[PDB]
Every structure is written in structure tokens, then in C-alpha cells.
Amino acid sequence: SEFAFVKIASDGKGFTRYGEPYLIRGANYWQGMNLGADDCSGGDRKRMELEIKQMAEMGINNLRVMASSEGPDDQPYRMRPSMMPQPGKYNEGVFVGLDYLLDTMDRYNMTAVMTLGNFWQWSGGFGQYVAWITGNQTIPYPVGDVTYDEFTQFAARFYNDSEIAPKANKLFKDHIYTVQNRRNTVNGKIYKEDPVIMSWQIANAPQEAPASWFEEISTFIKKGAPKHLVSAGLESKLDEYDFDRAHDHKNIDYTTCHCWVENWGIYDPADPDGLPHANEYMHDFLESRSKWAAQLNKPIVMEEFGMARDAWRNPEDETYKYLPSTPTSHKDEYYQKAFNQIVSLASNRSFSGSNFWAYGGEGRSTYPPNPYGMVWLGDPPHEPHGWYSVYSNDTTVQIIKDYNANLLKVQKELSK
Ligand SMILES: OC[C@H]1O[C@@H](O[C@@H]2[C@@H](CO)O[C@](O)(CO)[C@H]2O)[C@@H](O)[C@@H](O)[C@@H]1O
Numbered sequence: 001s002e003f004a005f006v007k008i009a010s011d012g013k014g015f016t017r018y019g020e021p022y023l024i025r026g027a028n029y030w031q032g033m034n035l036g037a038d039d040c041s042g043g044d045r046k047r048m049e050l051e052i053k054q055m056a057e058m059g060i061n062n063l064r065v066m067a068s069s070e071g072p073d074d075q076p077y078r079m080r081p082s083m084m085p086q087p088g089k090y091n092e093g094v095f096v097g098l099d100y101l102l103d104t105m106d107r108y109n110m111t112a113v114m115t116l117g118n119f120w121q122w123s124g125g126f127g128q129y130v131a132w133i134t135g136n137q138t139i140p141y142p143v144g145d146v147t148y149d150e151f152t153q154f155a156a157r158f159y160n161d162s163e164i165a166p167k168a169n170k171l172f173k174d175h176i177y178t179v180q181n182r183r184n185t186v187n188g189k190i191y192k193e194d195p196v197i198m199s200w201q202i203a204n205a206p207q208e209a210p211a212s213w214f215e216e217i218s219t220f221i222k223k224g225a226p227k228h229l230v231s232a233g234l235e236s237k238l239d240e241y242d243f244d245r246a247h248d249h250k251n252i253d254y255t256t257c258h259c260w261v262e263n264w265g266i267y268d269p270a271d272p273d274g275l276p277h278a279n280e281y282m283h284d285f286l287e288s289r290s291k292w293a294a295q296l297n298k299p300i301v302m303e304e305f306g307m308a309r310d311a312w313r314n315p316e317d318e319t320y321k322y323l324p325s326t327p328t329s330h331k332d333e334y335y336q337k338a339f340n341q342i343v344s345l346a347s348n349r350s351f352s353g354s355n356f357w358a359y360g361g362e363g364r365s366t367y368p369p370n371p372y373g374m375v376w377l378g379d380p381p382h383e384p385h386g387w388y389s390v391y392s393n394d395t396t397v398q399i400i401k402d403y404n405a406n407l408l409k410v411q412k413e414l415s416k
Helices: 032-036 045-057 092-107 125-134 148-155 164-180 211-224 240-247 275-296 318-322 329-347 396-415
Strands: 015-017 020-022 024-028 062-066 111-115 197-201 229-231 255-259 300-305 353-356 359-361
Touching: 020 396, 024 300, 024 396, 032 045, 032 062, 032 092, 045 092, 045 359, 062 092, 062 353, 092 111, 125 148, 125 164, 164 211, 211 229, 211 240, 240 275, 255 275, 275 300, 275 329, 300 329, 329 353, 329 396
Parallel strands: 024 062, 024 353, 062 111, 111 197, 197 229, 255 300, 300 353
Antiparallel strands: 015 020
16 A cells, blocks of 8 residues: 555646645754754754654644765764765764654654755765765865855766766765665664655755756666655756756656745845845746646645845844844745745645745754754754744744645645
8 A cells, every 4th residue: 555655646736645635834854863863963852853743733744854964074064963974884873863753753744855965065965975086075165265156066066077976976876775775763664665755855956967867866766766756856946948957857756946035136134125026036936937847747846945034123233133032024924925825826736835944943043052063953054043944933933834724725625
């Protein structure tokens, strides 16, 4: 019986599970694995269990999590301790964190999108694999005078450099194999047989990877886990051509987009008048990506989006922007409008849900780092702590809760 496995509907316009439509009432929780680790490897398991419980009470049925991270552990801007400090060598204390993450998600009947790698630097990612291959541990982190474009050209050698790509992909493939074949030490399930996992996701946000790379990798992931969906992890921030290069492949089962107004220069959170322009952008983003998904006849999930706190209330004070006590009136309206639009599109089966970025839970940006230097919450350590996290008692919690109720209501209407 594969009844419990999330599937694509035979008409391609949404997901199914248990013989019924399945809508994604999601959140991002990439920190789950590290919080699930035992106290010795810097975890806080009781807090992870409470965070999952908090999320179940807000109606969340789906977490996108990180199922990779690379050392070596002396690197800035990344998760510590790492899951894979050197190629093929695993921090078992961190890996057991993933086991518990998946076991707790099961008890709350959530599904997981298992992200297998990262283009960005905060879990090591593609840039780290490249560093292992060239033997050169000086990654050009985009801090100070180094730009994102320069870091991107370095990391993109993972799949564009005809000498580096085959060796890098060999290491990445060994990691994919190890994760798909992990026996969960808590409940005994082998990951590739676990219906709790909705999909394997190639990577977070690959930047202009060639078509033949998505073709190859997705095929390999699917042969590795034939019961599961496979996903690309693309932002879809460019155009339809870019979207097709990632998604038009027999083993990419559904499509995704990521919407970042501040990061793309669309939205300035210090500007008291900037919200309407971000709302409109979110608005055309959802309508146009929706059309691109429909042209491939595959489902679409907005698997990342977010907004900063109300920095415009005190524009000239940088620290104010990240304080938990700072309100989120813009973020709240932005989330609410996007959610209302998704609910309306999902009613005509032209969108399948979303995962906000990202749940902070009980973490706060004012807390001290743990002994490995981590202030765990929704913002990875390449970014200011507290930028986008949604905290357990934020006003945005009610908005997300209502959205998850509306989206479940729609899934029920469609199940008739
Ligand atoms: O910044 C929030 C969240 O965004 C994702 O990555 C962003 C992408 C979005 O376009 O662009 C960057 O800002 C680099 O320019 C990158 O950090 C998300 O996947 C995660 O990495 C990040 O926390």
C-alpha cells in the first residue's frame, strides 16, 4: 500500500494523499534537524518537539526542512555542527536529529519536503562541494567587498565547470544515497519507504543550472526513491524559459517558486509607504507563475516567501528592525493578501499551497548563541538573526492559522 504517499493527481493539477486532494499548508523549518540533535551536538529536542506541536496547532501539515549540511566546522555563515563535516563522514548526533524531526512530524501527521542540498552558503552547500573538489577552502563569502554575483559564479562551478561538476556531483550523489537509505533510529522506517516524506528536493535555489543537470539529478533521486515525489527547489525569479529548464523533466513531479521582495529590491522595509508595491508584485508573481505551472500541467507550491518587521517605524535605527518587540503590521498585511490569493487560486486548482519563511518558534534574535555559536530560529546564520522569523506569539501566527483553516476548507470542497 502506497496510500499514504503524497502523489500528483492523474490530471496533474494538484497533489493527492489517502485518495483525496492534498493542499500544502506549510512552513519552512530548516533548523529542525539541528534542534532535534541530542544536547551534546547542540540540539534542544524538547524545544523542537514543542515547535512542531505549536505548528500543528496553527494548522501546518507540511514542513520544508534541510536534510544536508557540510563542514568543515570552522567556517563562518553556516550551521554548526554540520551533518557532513567531510565528504562521506557524518556527524551521527546531527543525523539522529533528522530522525527525531521526521518521527515527531509523523505524530502530528505532517509531511516533509527533504531539501538535499543548498546553492547558498549557510549549510556549506554547492560552494563547499566545489571547495572540497578544488582542495581550496577559501570560499569567497559575499561579505564586505565581495558581492553575491561573485559568490554565485564560484558556487555555480558545481554544475557549470566541466572538470569540477562530475566530481562534485559524485559526492552529492553519495550524500543523496545515504539520506534516502537512512534507517530512522527512532521509529525503524527506511527514509525511502517513509510516507511522512512528501518529496525529495534537489537543492535550495540552484542559480541557472543547465537543463541536463536537472534531468540527471532528478532521475537519480527518483530511481533512488521510486515512491516519492521529486522537486527542483527553483526560485522561479526569472522568466518562463528559466522555469522550463528546471521543471520540464519527467522526474520533476511538481513546480515551486520563492518570492523575496526585499532581497530583490522591490520593497524597502524602512519606507512607511512601500507596502502597496510589494503587494502588487506578490500579486503578479502568483498569477504568472501559476500560468507557467499550468503550461507544464504540473502543481505549484510557493515554498518560500517572507517579509521583514516594521523597520519604517524607526528607519534610522538598524537594530530596531530585528527586535522581536518590533511590530509586523506590513508583514501581516503582505502574508494575508498572498494567502487570500492562494486560497482563491487553489479553489480553481491553480495553486497547491505554500510554505512561509520561516518559523522561529521559541528562538529569539535577542538570545545568546549556544556553545557552537548558533542562535537557532528561522534565519540562517548568513543573515541577521530575526530578519524574517515568525515567532511563537507574533501577530502573524493568527493570520497563518486562518489561512491554514481556509486552505483545509478548500481541500474539503475539492474532495467532494
Ligand atoms: O533571505 C531569505 C531566504 O531566502 C532564500 O535565499 C535568498 C535568495 C532569495 O532570492 O537570495 C539571497 O538573498 C542571496 O541573494 C538568498 O539568501 C532562502 O532560500 C534562504 O537562503 C534565505 O534565508
